[PDB]
Amino acid sequence: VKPRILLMGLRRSGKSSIQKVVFHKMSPNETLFLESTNKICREDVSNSSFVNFQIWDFPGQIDFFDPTFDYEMIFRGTGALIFVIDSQDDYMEALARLHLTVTRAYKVNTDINFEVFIHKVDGLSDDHKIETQRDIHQRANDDLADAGLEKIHLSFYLTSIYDHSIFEAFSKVVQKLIP
Ligand SMILES: Nc1nc2c(ncn2[C@@H]2O[C@H](COP(=O)(O)OP(=O)(O)NP(=O)(O)O)[C@@H](O)[C@H]2O)c(=O)[nH]1
Ligand SMILES: [Mg+2]
């Protein structure tokens, strides 16, 4: 089996940058040249001296009807779902889509590891970080409870492509997919 890791979230949250930086060692400064993602981009990690994975980079979530992705088929084969959130922008909508994403996925596969990347933290005071994470952690788990889905576990990470934090976070995600 080849474990799948999904990169989801609203447009511009930094999904593609994360993929390029972490797996293609693209420089963080080069990500300024990336363009909006229009189709899902699958990039596999094969023959790993640790563990092989499929990395799916999704275009940002928008209210556009297109029942062509067969999400049940995607989630069924998913090991980890990373929801990326831009911490330097309003995230109320981000939280709302995280809720729909997580619950829809959980309905198909309860073994999915849900990882929340509170991204672009490089632009926050080393305290504003604590508050943002505390706020996202609180609301997200509160939404889950209001739905009777408190059992769904959400891990949170403070990340930035401008330092080791994004690698440290991705590392912990991959570790959890190695039996
Ligand atoms: N400050 C900061 N900027 C970041 C970080 N990660 C990405 N960015 C910036 O955010 C921009 C948008 O990133 P991008 O990867 O295109 O976002 P995306 O979610 O893939 N967008 P879409 O969903 O439209 O394809 C990048 O061009 C980059 O300059 C980060 O850790 N910190
Ligand atoms: Mg993208």
UniProtKB/Swiss-Prot annotation:
Q: Which residues bind GTP?
A: 11-17, 31, 37, 60, 119-120, 122, 161
Q: Which organism is it from?
A: Homo sapiens (Human)
According to the lineage, what is the superkingdom? Eukaryota
Q: Which residues of the full protein are shown?
A: 61 to 239 of 400
Concerning its family, UniProt says: Belongs to the GTR/RAG GTP-binding protein family.
Phenotype when changing residue 59 to L: In HOMG7; increased positive regulation of TORC1 signaling; increased phosphorylation of the downstream molecule S6K1
Which compartment or compartments is the protein found in?
Answer: Cytoplasm; Nucleus; Lysosome membrane
Binding annotation for GDP? 12-17, 31, 35, 37, 119-120, 122, 160-161
Q: Which disease is it linked to?
A: Hypomagnesemia 7, renal, with or without dilated cardiomyopathy: An autosomal dominant renal disease characterized by hypomagnesemia, hypokalemia, salt wasting, and nephrocalcinosis. A subset of patients develop severe dilated cardiomyopathy.
What name has this protein been given in UniProt? Answer: Ras-related GTP-binding protein D
Q: What is the lineage of its organism?
A: Eukaryota, Metazoa, Chordata, Craniata, Vertebrata
Q: How does it assemble?
A: Forms a heterodimer with RRAGA in a sequence-independent manner and RRAGB. Heterodimerization stabilizes RRAG proteins. The GDP-bound form of RRAGD (in complex with the GTP-bound form of RRAGA or RRAGB), interacts with RPTOR, thereby promoting recruitment of mTORC1 to the lysosomes. Component of the lysosomal folliculin complex (LFC), composed of FLCN, FNIP1 (or FNIP2), RagA/RRAGA or RagB/RRAGB GDP-bound, RagC/RRAGC or RagD/RRAGD GTP-bound, and Ragulator. Interacts with NOL8.
Give the function comment from the record: Guanine nucleotide-binding protein that plays a crucial role in the cellular response to amino acid availability through regulation of the mTORC1 signaling cascade. Forms heterodimeric Rag complexes with RagA/RRAGA or RagB/RRAGB and cycles between an inactive GTP-bound and an active GDP-bound form: RagD/RRAGD is in its active form when GDP-bound RagD/RRAGD forms a complex with GTP-bound RagA/RRAGA (or RagB/RRAGB) and in an inactive form when GTP-bound RagD/RRAGD heterodimerizes with GDP-bound RagA/RRAGA (or RagB/RRAGB).
